[PDB]
Structures are given as C-alpha cells and as structure tokens.
Amino acid sequence: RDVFEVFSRDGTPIRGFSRPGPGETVVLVHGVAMDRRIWAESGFLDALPDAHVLALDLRGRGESGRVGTAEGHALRRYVEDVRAVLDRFGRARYSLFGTFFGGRIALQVAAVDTRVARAFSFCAHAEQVEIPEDAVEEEAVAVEGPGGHAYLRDHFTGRGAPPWMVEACARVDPGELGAATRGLLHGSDRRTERGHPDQELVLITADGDADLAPFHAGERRLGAHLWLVDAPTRIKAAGRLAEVGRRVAGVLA
Numbered sequence: 001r002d003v004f005e006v007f008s009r010d011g012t013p014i015r016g017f018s019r020p021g022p023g024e025t026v027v028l029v030h031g032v033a034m035d036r037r038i039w040a041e042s043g044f045l046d047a048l049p050d051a052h053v054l055a056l057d058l059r060g061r062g063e064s065g066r067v068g069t070a071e072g073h074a075l076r077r078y079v080e081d082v083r084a085v086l087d088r089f090g091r092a093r094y095s096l097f098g099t100f101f102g103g104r105i106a107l108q109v110a111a112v113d114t115r116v117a118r119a120f121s122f123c124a125h126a127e128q129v130e131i132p133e134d135a136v137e138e139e140a141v142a143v144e145g146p147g148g149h150a151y152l153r154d155h156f157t158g159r160g161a162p163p164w165m166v167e168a169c170a171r172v173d174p175g176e177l178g179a180a181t182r183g184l185l186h187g188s189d190r191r192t193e194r195g196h197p198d199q200e201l202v203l204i205t206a207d208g209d210a211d212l213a214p215f216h217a218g219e220r221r222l223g224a225h226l227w228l229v230d231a232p233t234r235i236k237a238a239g240r241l242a243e244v245g246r247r248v249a250g251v252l253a
C-alpha cells in the first residue's frame with residue numbers, strides 16, 4: 001500500500017491508503033465511530049482480489065484533519081472529502097462502497113458526481129428521515145464525555161457487533177464523536193437522488209431488518225438493487241461484511 005493526502009473544499013486534509021490493482025477503482029467510506037482500518041479487519045479488503053482500492057479516513061477520524069464543530073461535520077463536507085479522493089486518482093469511473101453512515105455518504109456522492117459508475121450502501125438506505133433534535137443532542141452528550149468510549153463499547157457489545165466494530169470506537173477523539181453526531185442536523189435527513197441513468201446503485205441489509213420498507217423505497221425510486229444477508233439486525237449484519245465483499249468482487253469482474 002501507498003499513503004496519500006488530498007484537501008477537501010474547506011481546506012481539511014484527508015489522508016488514506018491506495019492498494020494498487022489491475023481491476024476496477026473502488027473507494028471505501030467507513031461509518032461514524034470507525035476509521036479506514038475496518039476494511040482489512042472486516043475481511044472486505046481481502047475479498048477484492050483485483051481492485052485498485054482507495055480507503056480514506058473521513059474528517060475528524062483516523063489520520064485526517066480535525067474538525068471539532070457541528071457544521072464542519074455536515075453531510076456536504078463528507079461528500080467533498082470523497083470527491084477530493086476521486087480527483088487525486090484521476091479516473092473517469094469509480095465504484096464506491098460505504099458502511100452505515102458511510103453508505104449514506106456514498107449515495108450522496110453518487111447523486112452529485114458523474115464519475116461514480118457504481119455505489120453500494122451497506123446497512124443504510126437512501127430515503128428522507130426525520131431526525132429529532134433532542135435525541136441527537138442526547139446521543140452527542142453520551143458519546144463525547146469521559147464515559148463516551150465505554151458507552152459505545154457497551155452498546156455495540158450488547159448488540160453483537162463484530163469485535164473490530166467494538167474496538168474502533170476508542171480510536172475516535174471524544175470531541176469528534178460529539179461533533180459528528182450534531183452534524184447530522186445539517187443535511188443528512190434529506191433523501192438522495194440518482195446521479196445519472198447508467199449508474200448501478202445497490203443497497204444491502206439484514207434479511208431480518210426491523211425496517212425494510214425504506215430499502216424497498218429505494219428500489220422503486222432509484223432503481224437500486226437490494227441485497228440481503230442472513231442476520232436479525234443491521235449491527236449483526238456487519239458480521240457478514242466479507243461475504244458482501246465477495247459479491248462486490250463478482251460485480252467488478
């Protein structure tokens with residue numbers, strides 16, 4: 001692997017790695033309480049034999065620049081972070097894959113950037129949601145204080161998340177956990193759109209998901225394909241991420 005740096009629109013440095021390969025160029029976008037290490041730890045990276053893989057740390061996570069503000073974590077800023085990565089590698093076609101909120105980011109990049117030929121969203125849908133302000137603030141306070149890492153570790157352990165997803169939380173600065181949570185009030189509630197007719201859009205979730213309806217809504221509205229994995233909840237579906245990677249490799253082949 002090689003390391004790279006690019007700059008987002010607002011000046012924030014975005015750091016990542018490039019894993020060279022002769023196949024399709026794939027850009028991987030992690031979730032909120034995660035960083036770029038989850039791709040190897042989950043087995044997703046190993047499931048792509050040929051792809052040229054670009055994996056970024058989103059702002060405020062991993063080796064990327066600090067933010068520390070709610071508006072700095074708006075969805076539109078994360079989209080700008082990903083588009084900067086597309087610029088550096090100079091291709092006309094990319095395939096994006098995102099986990100949880102990273103899937104929502106990938107779908108929004110697809111809506112606005114004509115270089116995105118494929119976008120896959122793992123355990124996140126594309127529909128408008130209602131985001132209650134009081135619930136957001138309650139979660140931000142929970143995750144940003146001295147007890148915030150223990151709060152998240154206990155939450156994810158009790159919900160059966162894979163060990164890599166439990167452990168990633170303690171690698172995120174408490175202040176960025178709080179700010180990213182508040183950033184949800186700056187545009188993430190709106191639905192995402194199809195960027196162009198030839199794009200391939202894929203949603204993935206647990207067959208047991210308690211709220212499959214918004215996934216079916218994206219099939220209809222966006223012409224997206226829906227993939228299911230054997231799991232009773234979205235958090236437990238993360239145990240199937242390498243399996244999903246094998247099916248992604250089949251599309252890229």
Ligand code: NA
Nearest residue numbers: 028029030056
């Ligand atoms: Na990533």
